[PDB]
Amino acid sequence: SASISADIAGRYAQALFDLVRDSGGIDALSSQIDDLASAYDASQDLRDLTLSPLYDRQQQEAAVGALSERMGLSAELANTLRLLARNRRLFTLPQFVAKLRNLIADAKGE
């Protein structure tokens, strides 16, 4: 099916999308997703991190925040990745990226 991935993506990606929207982030937040999406297109790294079963959720929790630009992720960016991993669904990463980018577009527009 795969369509099921979007259901979680829409939520998980919205959770953080709200915090930045009200408190303050959207503008600077766009960069975080841009840079994050750029690292995800390192095929070897991206796949190894996201899609294959690596047994330990602890092993993959810290690894996630680390692989990201220890720099280009606000508090929420670090909090989200860990929580996402903690739930055994950090694999849905692109499904959320595309979702977040759209949130910005909605916040921008015409």
């Binding site: 099921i4 259901d7 939520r11 919205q14 709200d18 915090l19 929420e76 909090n79 929580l83």
Partner: protein, 85 residues
């Protein structure tokens, strides 16, 4: 499957973290409700078969302890229970 406790409103408090926000041990928040069944997030310490209490004062029995929710059977009219109670 998605599973409960993977909702936009609930995932905010898991990542944001307010002051003394936790209380997931002795308290919870309704994720879903219908047909005398309330799915509840939190209540990490509630026991299988424990009689818990809704904000209306209504009683409910914890028959299902699941990974990210508790299934509560309602001893009353479910019209008095809503999402987030």
């Amino acid at each position: 499957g998605i599973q409960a406790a993977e909702i936009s409103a609930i995932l905010k408090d898991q990542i944001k973290n307010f002051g003394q926000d936790a209380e997931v041990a002795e308290v919870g928040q309704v994720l879903s409700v219908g047909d005398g069944i309330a799915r509840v997030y939190g209540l990490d310490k509630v026991q299988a078969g424990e009689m818990v209490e809704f904000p209306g004062g209504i009683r409910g029995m914890v028959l299902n302890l699941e990974t990210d929710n508790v299934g509560v059977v309602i001893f009353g009219d479910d019209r008095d229970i809503k999402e987030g109670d």
